[PDB]
Every structure is written in structure tokens, then in C-alpha cells.
Symmetry: C6
Amino acid sequence: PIVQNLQGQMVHQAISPRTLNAWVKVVEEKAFSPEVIPMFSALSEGATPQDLNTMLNTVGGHQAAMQMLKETINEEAAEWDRLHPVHAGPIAPGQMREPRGSDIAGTTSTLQEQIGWMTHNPPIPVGEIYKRWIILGLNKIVRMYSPTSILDIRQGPKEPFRDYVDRFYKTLRAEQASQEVKNAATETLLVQNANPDCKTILKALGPGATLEEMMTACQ
Amino acid sequence: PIVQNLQGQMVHQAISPRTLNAWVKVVEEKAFSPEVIPMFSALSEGATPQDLNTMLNTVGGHQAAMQMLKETINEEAAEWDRLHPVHAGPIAPGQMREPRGSDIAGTTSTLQEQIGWMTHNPPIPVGEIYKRWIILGLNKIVRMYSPTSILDIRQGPKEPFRDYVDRFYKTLRAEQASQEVKNAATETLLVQNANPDCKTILKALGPGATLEEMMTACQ
Amino acid sequence: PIVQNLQGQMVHQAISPRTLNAWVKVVEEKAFSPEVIPMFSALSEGATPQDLNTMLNTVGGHQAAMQMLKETINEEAAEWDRLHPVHAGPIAPGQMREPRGSDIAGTTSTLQEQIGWMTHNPPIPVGEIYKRWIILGLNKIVRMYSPTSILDIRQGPKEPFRDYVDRFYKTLRAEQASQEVKNAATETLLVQNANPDCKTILKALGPGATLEEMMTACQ
Amino acid sequence: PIVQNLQGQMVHQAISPRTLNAWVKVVEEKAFSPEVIPMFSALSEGATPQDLNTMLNTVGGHQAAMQMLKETINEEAAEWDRLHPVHAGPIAPGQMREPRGSDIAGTTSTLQEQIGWMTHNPPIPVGEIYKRWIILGLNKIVRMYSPTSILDIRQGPKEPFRDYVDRFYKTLRAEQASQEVKNAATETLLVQNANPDCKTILKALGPGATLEEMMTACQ
Amino acid sequence: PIVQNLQGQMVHQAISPRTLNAWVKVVEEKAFSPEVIPMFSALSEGATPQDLNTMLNTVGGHQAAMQMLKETINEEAAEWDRLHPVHAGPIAPGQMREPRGSDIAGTTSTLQEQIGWMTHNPPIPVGEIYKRWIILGLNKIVRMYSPTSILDIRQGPKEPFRDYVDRFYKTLRAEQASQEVKNAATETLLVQNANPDCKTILKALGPGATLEEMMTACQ
Amino acid sequence: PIVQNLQGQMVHQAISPRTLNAWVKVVEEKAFSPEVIPMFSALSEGATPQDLNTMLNTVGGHQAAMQMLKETINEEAAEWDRLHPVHAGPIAPGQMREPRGSDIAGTTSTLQEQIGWMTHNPPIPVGEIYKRWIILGLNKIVRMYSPTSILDIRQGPKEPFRDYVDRFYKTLRAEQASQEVKNAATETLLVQNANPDCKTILKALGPGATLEEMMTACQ
């Protein structure tokens, strides 16, 4: 990653192997569950494209997911290129070539080029743009690690409301439900897909009770 | 988090992944038991709103609890807004917009805005105010990984007074009994919910014996 | 804790979560055995009252012991107040209010107030005074995690003298026997509470043999 | 490795034993699987030839692979020599001898010579050239179980398409299939080596569906 | 411990809890085996008396050994006092009181006094002198965790010479045999306490063969 | 070890306990296997003689090996002395006594003397010369757990060529075969000590096939 040195300049530093191993950790337990996303972001602050690739390259297994991820990245790359036409003419000292989609993604760019862009004035944040494309990939992949389908989340005959709740919101994340959607689902589906006794209690509570009030009424 | 640099200025630094992993640790063993609270605080000294979110976002599972937490945070946000009316007019260089509830919580604010507030003179401590709202959430959630049946805590027929005591105060924490309440409960309920032999001894000790004297009289 | 920065000033730094986890470690294995005491001290050098509380608050379990500890702390607080009458009148810039027992203990004092005291010239070392009160608590608690009836430490019929010795001095620590007491106990009780064969050998050695000579005579 | 000091000069620093142990780690679990490659690179940024050898020398086991690696390195060395004829004449102060293949590889060069080259103006990046040769070795070794054995990757009778996909691309990596090849294999072999039901669905999808569409059609 | 800062001055730093835990580690597995000695030394470079005590105080168990250790320390203290008479008269600014045995050992001295001595010009290395006394204690204690018994180390009927050798020198360490003694024992006892076939071979080798030649002759 | 400070001078620094523990690690798992050698070297860059001893002294167990190591070190010491006669006469300020074998090894030399030599102009690298002698010891010791009989490495009747290869080169390392020797052994012994079917195939391949071609022909 790029980081701030003593003299105020942003300079490059090697990715930490501790962080790569932490990333390996997460993927090894949680696979590509909704939480792999904020983690991947948290673990890659200030990363270059090379650093992002190094991280993705330590993933073992998940061959289909890696390919799906690659394909989103490549769709984002081709779009970048469409929306950014090349401007001709000679490059001045101190300046650099306009990055193509491939360069952002780190296929056609050197580490030095990546730092020059991310550190130029004004910078072109290739690491940030490429990490955006990777997160969009991750979004698509998580939807294979937690396939949507909320209508199939029903409270068991003797299942504690608490557990039914974890299974409800755990499914909403996977399908990347916005906070707005979760509010509507709570007022409706959560109530409806509950067991008979609870559904009567919840239905009795009135529309607009908070989640902590619902859990209390059906403990 | 924000921290003190050599030149005396408070500047930003990335959350440690070691701390995030430590936080993941705690939640993975203790779940949301009373101790998750002081820990969460201890692990987030000087945090920004982005840092607090990054931490909450590494929690896997507990979908119902996360939603309940979100809802408290949002109630605190809406209150903030109610008690802080917006003051119109142009923003001077060096100053910044008055934060809304959403900005405190980090939904509508950038990292730079968060640092400007927390580091301005006088600062507006968004990280502190948002961490307050999160701790209030945690309080509510622990009461789903904790029951308040102080009346149901009775000393077993052959249970050592020592163990009966851990089970008594362990229940008081969960229900967040102030230190004042604990004093009254010790003088009363602790004595009353004890086994026959001990209750006679304790009742014999007189009102006002310390906890170490009680344990001694019933060892 | 408070620590020395480059410019020579003592400034605050967040408690290390590594240290808190180390402290959790100790309590999780050794509970409140005599060794929990020097450890707690070693782990809290330069701590503020907030840091000391954060540490005590990560302890899980031991509800009776925590309450007993709280009560000593509060007795020490009330004494502090008795021996330190409040002096009236307005506070000058650069000065601060005289700490009460509650402030030392961190209930009524802010982190900033704690640093001002501990860092003022001359300082008022609230962290040191409060850590003293906590160690006195620990002393009382260890006497529920240990023994106290040295008279009950007898050498087994076929127990090696070496093991009998560890069990003898391990009990003396818990009961905080001074070095002077240990010398008298060695000359007497150690000899007397030994098995028949050893007791004759030790009694044969004469009063005044060293511990290494005793172990040699009964190997 | 060589790194940037405060005064701007690139100076030498000892390889971290933490990194060597991390490298030992990887090899001990993943052996020489496709991921050992980007890791080895990530762990050796800025390394000298001595640092690269130190790393290879901590590998236990894999005697055949180490020898195969040595042989590629030596073929690369002999080629270097072929393409770089020696230029005679006396060496000026401040300059150094032209490195031979053996020197790059670190057999005939001292640590000081390695730093002089890598740090000279213009530098001769022996550490970079030697790390290139090692990665080419690694490529050959990872194939210690290739094909083209893709024809043997068939979807099980009741195997989930997802798993069949990981096994397909996991085999493509080992055989170092370029991104171009993977695209053709996806359109063809992936479809053909799938179970009966899936193969009909995929064949129904039409040539040119993305990997995420294929997984969706056969979930 | 005391360590060298940037400005060249030796200043104090808190003992690392990582080191204390490492020390706890060693004692928890190896107890007080001959190797506890060089370790204790290695772990306490530059320590003050307070640091040495903090380390000894984290030892759990071994009550008899701790007391024996204390007694050696106290014998060394009383000797120090005998050989160093007190010199009267007022203390100049910048100077300090002559340390007594008790001060060296850290019972009667403050941390600041310890640093003043160890850092004065010329210094009085209390940490070094006290660590010497502790190592002498350790020596005595190890002789209860491995006392002695050489004549009892005989090579088994079908025991490999290699193993017989580890058991021979492992016993010599415990009994703290100097390097001079080990040489004589090798020429004699090692040969004599070997099995019949080996003893004839060794006896055949002639007096003065090295240990590697002996192992070769009896593999 | 000795290291480069900011002002350009080589000054001393305490051995890292992390490195000593890493060294303990290696010896505790791999014992004295061929890989202990490059590790020991990698872990001791820039070490003084005291640092090398501190490292050797943390080894537990292996009493016979430690003695054998000591004896090589002492043979190297006595040789040093033979080849370096003492030159008489008074020592000038700024200069130092010519080191004897014992001083190199750290028995008769102080830490300060070691630094003066290693840091003098021109230096006398006692740490380097002593580490050479230790590596020669290690070489001899590694031959205690392994066998120097390559003629005894034959491919099993149904043993996979791959495994036969690991057992061949694993034996070559132990006996420290140079890279030149390994090339000759591959062309000859590897082929000859293979099972009947493989030996015919290999013999069929012609002299001069690479190791990867041999493995392919006998998979």
C-alpha cells in the first residue's frame, strides 16, 4: 500500500503478510459470506492494484467464484475504457500515460506506474477504482454463498425467535438488502414467516414495533 | 482513530486489523455477554465513525442483534436531529457544516469530515457521540444474551455460597444494575435467595455486613 | 496509561488490548491465586483509573470476588475522603479540583481530569493511589482462592518432600506471609506437618538447617 | 532486502525471520500449489539474491522440486551469460564488475556486490532478475501434477455445479492456462464435462453466457 | 530494563509482557531444568531489580523452590553488606547513596534509585549484581529438578549409543558439570557405562577419541 | 548483533528474544535436520560471539549434539591459534589485542572487545569467524540423525518415482552434496537405484534428461 512517510510524501510499502494471512483466514472460515466484503475493504486500505491482486491470489479453492470475480473486474475494465477515450500526444516529464482498464486492474501496469498515479497531483486513484470493481465482484459472488430466497425462511415449530431472526437477516445481507428494505421486511415478512404462536403475538403488537420489542414478546 | 502525532496535532490513523480481529475474537466467544460492552469501548478509543462501523461490520452472524443495534443507533440519530436544529448560512473557510444524526453515524459523512469535526477547535466529537449510541445499543442487545430474573437466582441445596454469589452478580451486570442497586440487593435479595442454613447465618450477621464477611460466615 | 513522549512530556496512551487479553489470560487460568497480584501490578504500570477499570471490567465470572473487590475499593474511597477535607474557593487556570475518593476510583472523574492530576506539577497520582486500593482488594480476594489454615498442609504418606514443599509455600503466599514468617514456619510447621520418616530426619537435622539441606535429607 | 532510509538512500536490511517463517508456513500447508507463486513474490519485495536463497533454503522436504527449481535457475543463468558477453578492462572506483549468471543467482557474489548493483545508478537489479528466474521455476514445479489433464474433470452425478467449477479452474491454474484459454474452455469443456441435466441447461443457454449465468441456471 | 535511546542516554523501559509471558512459558514446561538458567539470563538483559522481581513473581507453583531461591538471594545480600561497609557523610546533588544488599535485591530501593545507579558514571550495576545472585539461586534449585546421579546412567542392552549420549550429558548439565569435567567424563564414565559391545569398541579406540568418532564406532 | 545506526556507525544491539524464540522453535520441531543450518545462519546475521552463544544456550535437550558442537568449535579455536601467532608489544589507544581462538568463541572476550573488533577499521570479524566454526559443527551434527549411504536409497517395488526422488535428494542434503555432485548423481545413481520398470524407461531416455522429464517418463 501507499502510506504517509515522515516528510509528508505518500510512498509505497509492501503488503503485510500478516494482513494477507488474515485475509486467507477469513476466506477459509466464512468463505464468501456477506461479511467477507467489509473485511476485504478494511484489510486493503490504501492498496495498489498489485496489492489487491496479491490478496486475491492467496485465495485457495473457490475456482468458480474467482472466475466470476475476474469477469466483473473485466466488465468494469472494458467500461472504464469506453467512458475514457485515449487522448494522444507526447508525455511530459513528471506526467504519465492515462491508465486503461487493464492498467487499473494491474495486468498491464507496473508497480511504479501504479504509485505514480496514486501519488500524482491530482492523483488518479487506480487502487481505489480497482477496489471498487473488486467489491462489486464480491457482491455478485456472495449471492452464490447465500443465494437469496427470503420466502423460504420460516420459523421452526419449536425454534426460538432469536435464531429465526439471525437466519432472516443473515439471508438479507447475502442478498444485499438496503437498510430501507430491511425495515419493510421486518414489518412484514419477519412477522409472516414466524411460527403460529409468535405470528399472533407479533400481529397483536401492531405495525411499528421495534425488533427488540418483537423479541421480547416472543421469548 | 485519531491520535496525537509528534508535532502535537491530532491526525488520523487506520484502525488496526489486530484490534478488529481482537474484536472479532470477543464476539466469537462471548457473543454479546455483559463483558462485550467494556471491551468494545476499550478497543475503540479515539475511533471515528468510520472506524466504529468497520468494527461492527466485521461481526458475522447475530443478524437480529445487528438490526436491533442499528435501530437504536437510528433512534439516537433522529433524536440528535430533533435536539439540534440546523442553522442556515454560508460556511467559512476552515469551518464545517453542522453534523446531522446521519453524519455522526457515518452514513452521510466522509472520513475527512469526521476528522475535521473531531479535530476542530472546539471539536465536535462525532466519534465519541456515535460510540455512546452504539454502547446504548449494546446494552439493549445484551439483554437478549442475558435474562433479568434476579428473583430466580436461588442458592442450591448443597451449592457453595461462593458460586451462588457469582450467579447473583453475573445476573445483575446483564441487567445493568447500578452500583447503588447492587448494594441494596446485597443487603436483601442475596440474603433471601440463599439456602436455609446460610440465610440463617446471614440473617444472624445483622444488616450491613460486607460481602467478604458474608462469604466467611457461610464458607 | 501515561507515558513519556519525545518532547519529555508525560501524555496519555490507550491501554493495549494485548495487555488486557494477557490479563484476561491470567485470571482465566490462575483465577485469583497469589500470583494474580504481582501480575496485575506488572500489567498496569502507569495506568489511569480508567485503564484500571477497563482491566477489571474484562474479568468474566467471579461475581462474588468482583463485589468484594468493589467494596474494598469503596472503603478505601470513603477513607480517602475522611482524611482529605475539601478546601473551598475558585479554581485557577491551570489548576484542578481536589480529587475525591470517587474521582480516584474513576466513577466521577473524566479521563482528562485523571491525566491532569497524574501529569500536574506536583502531580496527584490518582492512578497509583487507586491501584493501591485495588491490590488491597486483591489481597482480600486471594484469601478466598487459597487456604489460610496452614495447619491443613500435611505431607502425604508417600508424597515426595519436594511436592509437600510447593504446597506449603504456595499456601504461605496466598496468606501473604512476610519473609520473616516464612523463616519461622520453615523451622517449625514445615518440619511438623511432614510425614513420619521425614519428620524424624528433619528433627534429626537440628534447628537451623536450610531448605536445600532439608530436601536433601528427605529425597 | 533493500529499502528506502530517511536520507533517501536505498540501504540493505536483513530479511525478516517473520517473513521466512511465513514463507515456511505456506509451503508447509499448500506445498507448491498455484498460490505459492504470488505469495513468494509478495514475500520477497526488494529482496537480494542472498535473501531469495535464504528463503528457498528454509524449505524442508520437496527434494525433487528443489532440484528442478535449481535446474531452471541454472538454465536461466547460462542464458544470461550467453546474452551478455563480458566486456574487458579495469574497473573504476565507484563502478563494479558486470554480473554473471552465477552472480545474479548469488553463488559467486557477495552481499555487498548484490547491494552495489541493486543500488548503483543506473542499478542492475540482480534481485529482480533472479526472482524472475525463481518464479519461472515455481511455474514448472506447480505443474508437478498437470495434464493437459482437463479432459478428466467431469461433474459428478450429484455434484453441485459450484464445486465442479472450482475443480475445473483449479486445474487450469496448475496448467497455467492464460486468460484467453480459460474463456474458450468455459464456452466449451466446462459445458461438455458437466452432468447430463446441467449440460442440457448450459447447452440451452446459448454460446456466450457468463460464468455467473451458468451457475444460476444449474444451481 | 535500561536501554539506549536516540540521544545516546541509557533510559528505563517497562518490561515487556511478552517476555514475562515467555518466561512463564518456560517455567510452565521445563520447570527448573538446566535450560531454565540461560533462558532466564537471555530474557533479562539489561533488567533492573524491579524487572527481575516482576519476572520471578509471575512464577506460579514451585513454592519450595521460590523460597530456596529467596534464601540464596538473601545470603548474597548479607554478604554484599559484609564486604561493602557503609561510608558516612552527606550526599551531593547528582550522587546517590551506596546501595545495600536489600537495595540491590529491590526490597528497599525505588525504581528511580535503581536507574540512577545503573545509569550513573561510573554506574553501579545493581541489575547485573542482583541477576548474578538470582542465577546462583537457580543453580541450586535445578539440583532439585535434576539433582544428580551419573553412576546410574548406563547404556541399555539394545539402546542406541546416540540416546545413551543424550542421557549422559543431559545429566551432566543438571549437575552443572564444567566443560573440563565433561572432557574427563567422556574419556572415562561415558566409555565405562556403555553396553558390552560398545564398551569394547570404545576401549579399542584408545584414550582420546572425539565424541563424533565414538558415535561412529558404535552406530 | 552489530547494525548500522543513523549516523553511519555500526553499533551493538541486543539479540531479539523473538529471534531466540524462533530459533528455539526450529530446533524444537526439526531438531538438527539439514534445514537447521541455513536457518541458524539466517537468524544470526551480524551476530557477535555473545549473541551466537546466547542462541546456542537456549537449546534444551540434545546434550550429545551440543558437546559434539562444542568440540568442533574448540578444534577450530585451537587451529586459529596455530595459524595466528601472537605478536608482542604494547597496545596503542584505539587499537586492541589480537583475538585468540577462545576470544573469537566468546569464552575469554567481553562484549565490548567483540564490538571493537567487529567494528574496527579494518575490522576483525570475530562474529563471522565464530559463526563459520558453528556451521561446521552443525554440519557434523546433522549427520547424526541422517545417513551418509546413498547406495542404500533404492526405489520400492511399487513406490512412486516422486517419493523415491524426495528420499534421494533428502539424503544428498544431509551429506551436503554440492550442486555439482547432485547433477552427477541424477545422471547416474538416481537412474540406477530406481525400480526395474523405471530404470529401463530412464535408461531409455538417454543421458542428459532433466529431472522433470524423468518424473514424467515414470509417473
